[PDB]
Symmetry: C4
């Protein structure tokens, strides 16, 4: 391993705050760009956003809200198989075109071939994963999300291969990985969508507790290079703080992004708001935090207990409705695509160029040297 | 686009706080350097400063004040065509040599061929842009500023070409761009002066909301390279916080700079001062903030509404008169030209050299390890 | 020295916060990885951790606690030879398998060939170093730690050679060094284990007072390269703040780490807790601080007094028991080895790869943009 | 100037916080290293320290105190020629070996060939510079310091050449410069000692107001390269915050350093202490601040008034005596020379090597993650 010894520090990594997209000749206005993305032949989104499979982010109510805005929700797995199946049934029974009380239309709703809202569901690697997958498919789930901390592991890959073999037609998302070799290993066993991100999440301590990770722009770019070879897709999962980071994640190769923090504290996230000193907040916590792993309500098999936590528990200010949050994100995405001359997301992924910057460039990019007197809806 | 794919992260960008000017052999004292600049055959400034075309920076009163100090003001377009024409008439009727009450002389006033103070005016891309340009020219405007967020866009370039074709002699400023190709596209349709800057403004959130921009020293240098080929000029617009940044912007290739924040809160900026807890302040806000776009007084056509804001609203401490602010900026410019051995701005643009530095170099450059006991007039 | 003149600034250095470990294909779960390390033929640890030889970190009580968890303690030398010999006798008489009051077992205890807890002891370079070493060996010490600020010095190397010559079988740790040439100079006189680190300690001011040091990841990597050539080992000493830094230190080539700050404020560190404003704390101080050097209780020879201090005196929040702290560190190490696919520490040292990152990458690695509401046991 | 255009951003610059000295094999203990330096054949210091020629740093009382510790003071020029001559006479009449009340010896005093304390004096470029130089020489001054903001200027070089021509034997210090070409231009007209530094001072705003400067480690190294060719010396002037920065400045090529901030607030600096909220402080201000330039006591010719200030006015905590401050600095220098294996300053300048580091390396170098409970005498 003298070869590995001499190359220990060769690789370099970039994150969102290291880069900007370069403006380019543009023939398309922001309101005319196409935000649609085909994640798999049977799974098309109208906005490139997945809500995170976390017990403070996505149950039925969030999955309904985000699918009606054109995305898709991943119902978390910290519940019994029967409970998670019923959450999916709630999504598939929900109104997808519009509701009255006076007329709220959902013209951009992401739907299956039968006009029902799309919905996804997380599963782990446990003895009962096949049963959970079976009951989710029977409930009408549109994608299974094999959600693991280290997707590039023999045990995970073997479990996916067995799932792919028994359930030949379900769309399989699997993750997380952060390297080309990890993405390739998953696509080679039949994964449809690879989820990218080790450590970048707002609530996570993986990089500090284990010392492991890849800066997220590099992780996306390295994994998207492999996805292009297979003709498949990736989800850029974690570390997105502003709408501009979504544009960066997609331009680096992401077909869609997954959001935790930016959707935390919305009306449709699980739990209720709590008033503290005249201010509204909601809980947001890592799925590897102590509170999230100490779940024990009805019985379910959980992933093998980790010795020490890899997330923290926190609270976020109340944000409002999912519809209003998505409206702000979409406006930012459309603005960025207009600046880069991208009429659709394929052009953004394939053609856009970045410029690297220092911490001084970052300070120039935010507002600077001004006393802000009102919070902007997209800059809180 | 495998070529674009492999070069996604090739480009690097520098901003003001990344660089310093290197001192050089100097035969000229600061008081003897020449700060004049010809922006176009009919538009000569005595100090290389344009005031920003913003509704909290420049109306008639600011345009008069800054032209009397040797610069030029861009009257903003958030008003009716008739109102904006009358603002220009106020500037062109104002005294340009001196006034009494006891004798205030303006020996460095920038004037047209008839001895009237110079004045510029912003226009957008709307159906009535030709009428606005016509009435501004009839009012005696010295330059039209085609003010757009993304100047490198087919719609903007087509509108400029049509304007250039109907009004063959007016000086046209157009922007904003941040790349060589964007500058070239504008000069090729007859723009006289290209305005450079995407995202660096103090009050702006473009880089964070859309993910797009270029660090401003690189943007200036890339665009000035093209201006040199055409024998035309550029305005370095945005991100200047100190007089030393003006010297940097000009040495990077800028023929002149445009200032928002450094002129905000002056007596001549629009609005009145407001006392808050014994301290004086004035409002300063992005033209892409909610308050600035929600203007609706007399009717006018506005640029197409953007879905989400790209600026914030803020307040700045009262600064004093435009004359005293310009005096401090000019003293800093003259000092920098003396250090670089530049007898005039052409030598500064063409000959001066920079040295790149880290964040540690930046901390050494400011005052450090001292409890400042009085604010300096040029270091507040 | 024109050769030295032209290469003054050639070398570059990395520390923990500059790098992350890259995840790799993994066939081993965290609970099955092997944390054992042979530091020398007669000195095997079950977890790769040495407690620092400091008078606020390690006396008999800490050495017992950490050996029972699988590591080894270095009893400090700021005491008489007789006192330090008695501390070692206390360790070697202590129960190593388990104790009652109800049954506390120590299944991972690091023991000598007679079933007694391992223990090490610091010595200096003074006239009586041979006598101190003799009495420590008679007490049953398992390793002597020649503890000096600048191990790459003629006086230190000559003293070690004389010790190695009189005491032919004792395990000798010597330090500190930070360069390949310094490590080589010590291994060449018979040192068994080289201790690496000049300036990285939490409580130390060496780099700021003397201007001297090497960023600690580079120091480890440079010295481990030499250790590999000799077939010997190194201790990565100083600058570790989180369990993830331990994984980084070992992957950079360290066979084991030495901890001060992460063990300060434990029940078993010397001194008692002091309540200040309802909060518990303990003292932690550099061995080069004024208070630590002004020791004058029973008489002992001290290293030559330094003119000015090179450490500070501080206080740390109470941490709890050594057992609970080690449990958190080990969980983090096991998680990192699982992510890197390392079944044992040899694979981590020899095979793991890093990715370099900016300050923006570091901010993404920690929790960001969240109001943490409870402290994590491994993220305080 | 297409050659200058393409090389605008080629040069890179380092400051103190960017680098560390690498430890090396050492045969010399800190107490045995030689801190002497010959600045010129008739000017030898016993510690390599000049006190700054500033009206809040050096008059007779500071010049006496620092010469008795082995350095030399530069009496500032913000006073009449007669007054400045009398300050020098006070220094040359002062006791240099020792004083009683009980016996204070000054065994390291820097003295002239007649046993009188060394002393230097600042002069400017004015019409009466020849008269000031004449009266200072008649008073027995050991060096004249031509103190200008931009030493690489025709007017300064012409004035120095005329001085060198009339006063053929006085030691001439001249500055400030920051480039090889500026140093060469001064040595070529007969300057004995070149003073290096544009912008790094604690109290100065030159880099922010004018945009001009060179990071100080690079400035020293570039200028020392020229000094080596001429067989002459340089003073590293400005930006030194800790004793470790002195070691860095000398290892980068400086023969001696000049200190402002580290000597401000001492008993011997001009002015008295002022109690503010139970705490002692003294004034410290740039010679380019408004208060320092608005001096108008007895009449003197001042350098041409600059339009705008290039320094600020501040206050520093009381530090104690010059003797105690120098003792701490010398201890740090001796420690660094011991670590680098430098028996004298020539070896430090010629042989020592640096390692470059990031901001993460800097945070590791200072104390980190500790609540300091007492201020160290060399780390306040
Ligand atoms: O290392 C981790 N420890 C955790 O406890 C944890 N919880 C969530 N996640 C991941 O973070 C993503 C959400 O990130 P953001 O809040 O930044 O959008 C999610 O989509 C997950 O990928 C975790 N990662
Ligand atoms: O992205 C933007 N969103 C906005 O809302 C906005 N408002 C002003 N500007 C631009 O900023 C310039 C002034 O910048 P400074 O205050 O830094 O001088 C101005 O001259 C404009 O170029 C904006 N840019
Ligand atoms: O330069 C120094 N001056 C000091 O006063 C000092 N005291 C301890 N040490 C060293 O720091 C190590 C502990 O570092 P941490 O607290 O970061 O674990 C220890 O293991 C030592 O190597 C010192 N280094
Ligand atoms: O640009 C400047 N504007 C000023 O007003 C000023 N005053 C002092 N100096 C220079 O700073 C040096 C002292 O620096 P320190 O306090 O960092 O030691 C001094 O030795 C001078 O070289 C100035 N430089």
């Amino acid at each position: 391993s003298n070869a590995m010894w001499e190359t220990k520090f060769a690789k370099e990594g970039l994150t969102f705050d290291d880069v900007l997209l370069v403006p380019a000749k543009s023939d398309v206005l922001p309101n005319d760009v196409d935000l649609s993305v085909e994640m798999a032949p049977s799974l098309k989104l109208n906005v490139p956003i997945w809500s995170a499979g976390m017990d403070t982010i996505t149950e039925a109510k969030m999955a309904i809200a985000i699918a009606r805005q054109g995305g898709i929700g991943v119902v978390h797995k910290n519940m019994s198989i029967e409970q998670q199946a019923e959450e999916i049934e709630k999504v598939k029974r929900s109104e997808s075109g519009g509701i009255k009380d006076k007329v709220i239309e959902f013209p951009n709703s992401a739907k299956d071939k039968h006009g029902r809202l799309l919905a996804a569901a997380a599963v782990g690697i446990t003895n009962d994963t096949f049963v959970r997958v079976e009951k989710l498919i029977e409930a009408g789930v549109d994608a299974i999300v094999i959600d693991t901390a280290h997707g590039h592991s023999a045990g995970v890959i073997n479990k996916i291969s067995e799932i792919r073999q028994t359930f030949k037609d379900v769309v399989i998302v699997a993750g997380n990985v952060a390297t080309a070799e990890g993405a390739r290993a998953l696509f080679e066993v039949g994964v449809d969508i690879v989820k990218v991100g080790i450590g970048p999440g707002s609530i996570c301590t993986t990089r500090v507790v284990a010392g492991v990770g890849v800066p997220q722009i590099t992780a996306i770019y390295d994994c998207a290079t492999v996805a292009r070879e297979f003709g498949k897709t990736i989800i850029a999962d974690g570390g997105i703080k502003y709408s501009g980071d979504i544009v960066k994640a997609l331009a680096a190769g992401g077909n869609a992004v997954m959001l935790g923090s930016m959707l935390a504290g919305t009306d449709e996230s699980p739990g209720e708001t709590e008033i503290f000193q005249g201010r509204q907040f909601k809980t947001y916590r890592g799925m590897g935090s102590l509170a999230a792993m100490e779940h024990g309500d009805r019985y379910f098999q959980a992933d093998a207990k980790k010795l020490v936590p890899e997330g923290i528990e926190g609270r976020v200010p109340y944000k409002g409705s999912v519809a209003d949050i998505i409206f702000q994100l979409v406006g930012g995405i459309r603005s960025g695509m207009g600046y880069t001359g991208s009429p659709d997301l394929r052009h953004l992924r394939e053609e856009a160029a970045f410029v690297r910057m220092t911490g001084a460039g970052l300070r120039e990019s935010h507002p600077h040297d001004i006393q802000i007197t009102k919070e902007a809806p997209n800059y809180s």
